[PDB]
Amino acid sequence: GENITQPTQQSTQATQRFLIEKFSQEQIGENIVCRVICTTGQIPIRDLSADISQVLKEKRSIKKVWTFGRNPACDYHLGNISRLSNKHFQILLGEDGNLLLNDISTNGTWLNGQKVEKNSNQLLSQGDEITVGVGVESDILSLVIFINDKFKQCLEQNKVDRIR
């Protein structure tokens, strides 16, 4: 008895069960540039995506950037806090198809426990993470980006060459 069949009278509902279905509903991210997951809780898992076709052409089509802060949802739509919360950081996509991270914060942006320069694009890293609001162990906020290897696999399958 692993599957479900012939349910007996026990509990009926069409609300809470629906939420569970969506959770299990796994979506494919082959064109989905990358997914950002804020573990600290500052920002909710937001899916970052881009057009693969743009990468194939490059130059002409390759300009997409995600922003976290006071926006209707640039990258994410969040409240308006004069300190850390507003346009607190950004993610850049492009440069030979690769991905870049732009740390935009008011006074301090961190990378894996290493304070960095503001509005400073960064080379994408596997499971990279940006920390913000440093000073007190109890007042630090973290940001993590989960890149889909599927996207990288596609680029490899479509290498550049002109040999007959």
Side-chain angles (χ1 to χ4, degrees):
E2 297 285 19
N3 311 133
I4 308 151
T5 174
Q6 285 218 125
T8 54
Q9 219 246 115
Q10 247 206 237
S11 44
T12 315
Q13 56 216 322
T15 333
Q16 288 285 25
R17 185 259 285 176
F18 183 43
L19 308 177
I20 307 300
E21 219 135 81
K22 188 136 80 221
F23 225 98
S24 175
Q25 212 222 258
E26 296 206 276
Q27 312 169 59
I28 314 305
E30 190 112 317
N31 313 332
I32 245 260
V33 123
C34 61
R35 200 222 311 190
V36 62
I37 312 178
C38 243
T39 183
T40 22
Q42 250 250 128
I43 299 98
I45 296 155
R46 216 67 246 289
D47 314 87
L48 327 181
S49 356
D51 259 49
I52 284 183
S53 226
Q54 324 232 268
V55 191
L56 263 87
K57 201 66 226 259
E58 102 207 336
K59 229 302 153 51
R60 256 54 262 284
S61 315
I62 188 57
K63 309 201 201 175
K64 201 127 56 171
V65 189
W66 284 258
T67 306
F68 287 142
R70 278 176 68 175
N71 282 124
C74 234
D75 187 345
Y76 173 66
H77 183 194
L78 68 109
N80 43 102
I81 258 174
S82 208
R83 280 132 241 295
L84 359 163
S85 260
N86 15 22
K87 303 185 284 229
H88 189 90
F89 150 117
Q90 294 180 253
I91 291 134
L92 140 66
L93 167 86
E95 197 221 74
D96 216 46
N98 303 78
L99 291 82
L100 253 55
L101 271 69
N102 209 24
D103 284 351
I104 121 175
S105 300
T106 311
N107 50 81
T109 316
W110 269 257
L111 139 59
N112 292 356
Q114 314 213 304
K115 144 151 259 222
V116 282
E117 309 193 30
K118 183 174 181 167
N119 316 299
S120 91
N121 287 126
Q122 305 291 329
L123 176 61
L124 181 93
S125 358
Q126 251 304 281
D128 177 77
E129 177 204 81
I130 320 294
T131 301
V132 310
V134 177
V136 184
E137 267 158 321
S138 18
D139 86 336
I140 295 151
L141 286 301
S142 179
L143 311 119
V144 187
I145 254 124
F146 178 94
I147 322 99
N148 43 304
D149 219 349
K150 288 182 278 291
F151 196 112
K152 245 165 165 133
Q153 199 200 268
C154 195
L155 249 295
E156 253 195 303
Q157 218 201 85
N158 322 141
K159 62 160 121 114
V160 288
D161 243 307
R162 310 171 100 198
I163 314 175
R164 291 288 130 68

